[PDB]
Structures are given as C-alpha cells and as structure tokens.
A = this chain, B = another copy of it.
Amino acid sequence: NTRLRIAIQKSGRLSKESIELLSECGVKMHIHEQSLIAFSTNLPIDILRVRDDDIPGLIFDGVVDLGIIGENVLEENELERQSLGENPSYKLLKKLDFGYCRLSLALPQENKFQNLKDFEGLRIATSYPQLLKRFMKENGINYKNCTLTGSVEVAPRANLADAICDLVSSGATLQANNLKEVKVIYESRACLIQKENALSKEKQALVDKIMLRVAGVM
C-alpha cells in the first residue's frame, strides 16, 4: 500500500471542517458511515475516521501519516505518553483556523469564587486529567481528581465532584448545567500534524502538494 493515510475525527467538533478542508485542498472522497476507512477517488489517500482521542497516538506510533486534531487532545495524550516514560514525537505542519475552544475550570453558579486558591482540596471532574494536573501543579494548588470521558458537566449535580475542568466554545453547556466559567487553563484550535519518521519520496511529495494547497486555501 502506497496510499497516504490521513486520520480525522469520525464525528464531533472537527469532523465537518476537517472534511471541508480536505475537499478545498482538492481531495475528493465520499463520507457516509464508513466505520473506519474512506477512500479518495482522485488521489492515493485514505481518510481514517477515528475517535479524536486516538489521533495523537496514531501519529506518535507512525500508524498514519497525517492527522487533524485539536491542540488540547494532542497535548493531553502527549503528556500521558511522556508520563509513561515514552518520547512521543510529531511534526506540526499547520495551525488551522477552526476548532477554537478553551479548557476551563468551572464551578456551580452559586459558588463564591475569589481566587484559584478556592480550588484547594476540591474534587474536580475532567476528561483531560494530564492537562488539569500540570496546570494545578504549576499554580501550587492541591485537588482530587475525577476522570470522566463524558457528561463531565453533570458531575457536580451527581455529587461526584465540586467543580469541573472542561472544553467551552459557546458557553451553552455550562449555562445549561448552571455552572460558571472561572479560569481558562488552555486555549486550543485544530492543527495538522505528521508522523516523525520520514515518508517515502512519493508520499512526501503528495504532502508538500497538499500543504501548498492548505497554505493556498488559507
């Protein structure tokens, strides 16, 4: 197999815009329900539709050639890999102009918040435990972890946590759960990344062509 492998989010925040970037770069393909692999009809390119949390790993492990992924997800998994004693590596090709969001600490609307110190001792629910951990350590604040993959914003109401650390874009989900954003700990946007090890000449040439197109398209 000589086909370039690009991993994108199967469904979620980045899916639509990732597909549109690719088509704007002249990559034609049909996306409809394929469980894992879609095939460009005009170029030797395979689009792997995966859970976003898997994309950093696929790139670090050299399973795919390119990936489109949020900085937050990339950094969370990079930190996890580094904490296991590994050396995750990737090339950053381009910071993209979509997927804008921020990872923030949030409290029940009725809670008094003067200072970050108010998070001392608190149980904090998040899907990004490594990012949360690094931030709290850097700011000298002790807390108790609660790792949930979904429904993080329900954790205070379920009495699993006193607070949360979660992605915010519109702020609608925090509002719906009667929570308030008190401290941004990370700002994110989508990026295009490549695996570390050199591609074949053919593949690198196609990547350079796509990057011109991305640069051009931008």
Contact = CB atoms under 8 A, between A and B. Distances in A.
Interface in A144-162: 144-151, 154-155, 157-161
Interface in A72-126: 80, 83-85, 123
Contact of A46 (B58, B80, B158): B158
Contacts of A147: 54, 57-58, 61
A195 B144 CA distance: 14
Contact of A84 (B37, B62, B80, B148): B80
Nearest to A63: B146
Contacts of A48: 158, 160
In the assembly, how many copies of this chain are there? 2
A35 interface: yes
Interface residues of A, number: 38
A48 B84 CA distance: 29
A212 interface: no
Interface of A: 1, 3, 5, 35-37, 46, 48, 50-51, 53-54, 57-58, 61-64, 80, 83-85, 123, 144-151, 154-155, 157-161
